[PDB]
Swiss-Prot record, chain B:
Quaternary assembly: The basal body constitutes a major portion of the flagellar organelle and consists of four rings (L,P,S, and M) mounted on a central rod.
Protein name as it appears in the record: Flagellar L-ring protein
Positions spanned in the full protein: 175 to 232 of 232
Protein family membership: Belongs to the FlgH family.
Superkingdom assignment: Bacteria
Organism expressing this protein natively: Salmonella typhimurium (strain LT2 / SGSC1412 / ATCC 700720)
Role: Assembles around the rod to form the L-ring and probably protects the motor/basal body from shearing forces during rotation.
Amino acid sequence: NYGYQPLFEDRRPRNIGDTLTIVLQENVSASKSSSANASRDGKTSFGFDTVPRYLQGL
Amino acid sequence: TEFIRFSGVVNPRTISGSNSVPSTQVADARIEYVGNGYINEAQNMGWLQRFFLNLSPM
């Protein structure tokens, strides 16, 4: 005797020793990315090509 | 000579009307497919090559 068995219920595992089908379908995907930047450019100039007389000493 | 061995546990309700069940419905499925003769010995690594594959630094 295997005990009471439901008639219309779907066949499910209920006790120790019962079998069950596992459909292994795994799809995992993780990603991450980052960046940082900094820039600085500086140019400066001053030139006196021709200096008038009253400015010579300066 | 080739040997195909199968072992496992089958649920009676998974067996089809033609007395057939796919191998993916067997709980503890043990499947083996081996052979002998010089064809099978030609697919074995040499002892020195196995020793190197297991003990070589790279």
